Amino acid sequence: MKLGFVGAGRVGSTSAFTCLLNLDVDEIALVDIAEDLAVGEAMDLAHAAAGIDKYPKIVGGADYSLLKGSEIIVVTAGLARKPGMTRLDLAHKNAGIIKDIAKKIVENAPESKILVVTNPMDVMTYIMWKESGKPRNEVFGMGNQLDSQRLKERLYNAGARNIRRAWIIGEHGDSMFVAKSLADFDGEVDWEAVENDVRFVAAEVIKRKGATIFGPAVAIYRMVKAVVEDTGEIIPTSMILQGEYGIENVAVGVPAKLGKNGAEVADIKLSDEEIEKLRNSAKILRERLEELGY
Amino acid sequence: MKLGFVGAGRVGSTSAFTCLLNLDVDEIALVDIAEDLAVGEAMDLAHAAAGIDKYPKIVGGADYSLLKGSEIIVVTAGLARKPGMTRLDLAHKNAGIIKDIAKKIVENAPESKILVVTNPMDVMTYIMWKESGKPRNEVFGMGNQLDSQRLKERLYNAGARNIRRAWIIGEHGDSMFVAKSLADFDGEVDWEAVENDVRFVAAEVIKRKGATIFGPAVAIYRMVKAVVEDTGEIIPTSMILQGEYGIENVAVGVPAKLGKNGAEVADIKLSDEEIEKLRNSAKILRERLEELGY
Numbered sequence A, B: 001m002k003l004g005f006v007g008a009g010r011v012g013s014t015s016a017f018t019c020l021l022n023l024d025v026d027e028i029a030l031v032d033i034a035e036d037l038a039v040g041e042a043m044d045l046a047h048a049a050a051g052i053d054k055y056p057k058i059v060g061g062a063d064y065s066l067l068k069g070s071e072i073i074v075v076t077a078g079l080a081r082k083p084g085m086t087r088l089d090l091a092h093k094n095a096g097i098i099k100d101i102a103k104k105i106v107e108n109a110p111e112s113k114i115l116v117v118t119n120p121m122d123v124m125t126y127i128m129w130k131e132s133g134k135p136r137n138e139v140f141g142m143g144n145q146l147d148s149q150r151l152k153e154r155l156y157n158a159g160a161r162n163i164r165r166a167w168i169i170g171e172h173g174d175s176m177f178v179a180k181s182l183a184d185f186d187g188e189v190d191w192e193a194v195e196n197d198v199r200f201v202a203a204e205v206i207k208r209k210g211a212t213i214f215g216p217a218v219a220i221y222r223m224v225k226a227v228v229e230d231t232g233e234i235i236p237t238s239m240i241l242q243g244e245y246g247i248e249n250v251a252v253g254v255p256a257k258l259g260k261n262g263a264e265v266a267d268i269k270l271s272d273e274e275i276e277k278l279r280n281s282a283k284i285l286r287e288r289l290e291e292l293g294y
Ligand SMILES: NC(=O)c1ccc[n+]([C@@H]2O[C@H](COP(=O)([O-])OP(=O)([O-])OC[C@H]3O[C@@H](n4cnc5c4nc[n+]4cc[nH]c54)[C@H](O)[C@@H]3O)[C@@H](O)[C@H]2O)c1
Pocket: A006, A007, A008, A009, A010, A011, A012, A031, A032, A033, A034, A037, A076, A077, A078, A079, A080, A097, A100, A101, A116, A117, A118, A119, A120, A121, A142, A143, A146, A172, A211, A212, A213, A216
């Protein structure tokens, strides 16, 4: 089992750490535009590994060949702002990075699944799937899983117990929504309060701590697990839709089944009201793609 | 089981994350001079927790009362340099911080064990034990464990397999040494190369990645585990010596037994040559304490 990470930044290295703690990993590859960082992260991670008596081959660098063999590759590479920048300006900057990476991944690990994390995630995962020859089963995004975790946290805070299934789907962004219909748990809540707490926790965390790190890391892990362990779990995933729920030519968050072969839309029955909301997010997402030439 | 962290910085939060991934923790408390950071780390950590269906009470802030109940408290709080500063200047600055913390911990979690991590670790753990009424079993330092992990990594790299026990003891610093005598593993190495690779890996990692983070985090975890799970493991620990191996009135790295009651010197038989080296580190450490008024 080889794991690839493009981007050894905060989220890249921490999510890899997480996988190291919780997966039977043989090799870990870290590729980043900043070489010494990739390398330095690879060293630290190995020192960590020895503390749970694990000794995988962990290599970090700036050359994409390191990725050969990766069963799957987490792509966190990208930019921040200059808080005088703009969502659009960044989308362009990062879109360039994702294009460039897509090529690289195809000509080094042409058979690997790809987990897109770079924000705006739903848009970047789409640009990744388009820019690489790949089928829609080998390219998908981490997002709603993270949103969901946050959801479950506010639910337990609101008295709910035995929470199997509470999901958020749609755009990993303002346009997100809870799938009330699929929610299952003991205790009564207040979807008003909860759904709203969730749209800007991300921002509240970024305000205080600097970035969202551990939340995202775990969500990435659960998605990697599901695949490298062929668990067949269903996890809200940013998927390329090509008919499903009435939605076409965009990536957006939907219940998906993960396993060795990647992701495939679970096709779970959604409320009528919820397919509306899903179509909302797709329109928003579609527009933001056009602004970019996709 | 409550865990306390004083310092929500890189090492503080990451080591707590690690504990969250691998321990049955009921509450986690994060105290830091920077409030919003402690708070922001507490939020992120909870979002993480929900992803492995854990829902402990995780609280972060700048008020030390948050620590009441902590079975044990990891202290990572402290400073960096201005790379035009000096080891001594920092030792003074941090010594102040440790003194101040010792008081705080005593008047909020007077019964908790204390894991000292702040560098220079052996010196800070001593100042912690002195400045708090506490017995030498409730105050100790993380260091050699980390050095050891690094050791095991260079050993496996050098062909060695089935490595039960490879330890580094003495000063967590230039003055450290391998306990060749206690080393057990299949395969032949080259203690020359290895022991030397180890003294400045730390520095090589800091050069490239910025700081040592994941290595330290795991080592802290293994020490917390050993205690909160009363495992009775033996781990190279910076212990206050009061007779052992011919050494007095200083903290320095030695095989220790960890468990519910804290740490106690394992009193393992060391080479004659190795008790020399141990006495070396103690002299060096003792001098550095005097420079500080201890
Ligand atoms: N989907 C989610 O829910 C979610 C949650 C949280 C965060 N995110 C997102 O993930 C992204 C990264 O999040 P992050 O905090 O880890 O960001 P970071 O710490 O700055 O590390 C970035 C690294 O990439 C590097 N780098 C820059 N350019 C390139 C590059 N690598 C390769 N190439 C090749 C060509 N160009 C490049 C650079 O050298 C640096 O080391 C951001 O968009 C976040 O919003 C998503």
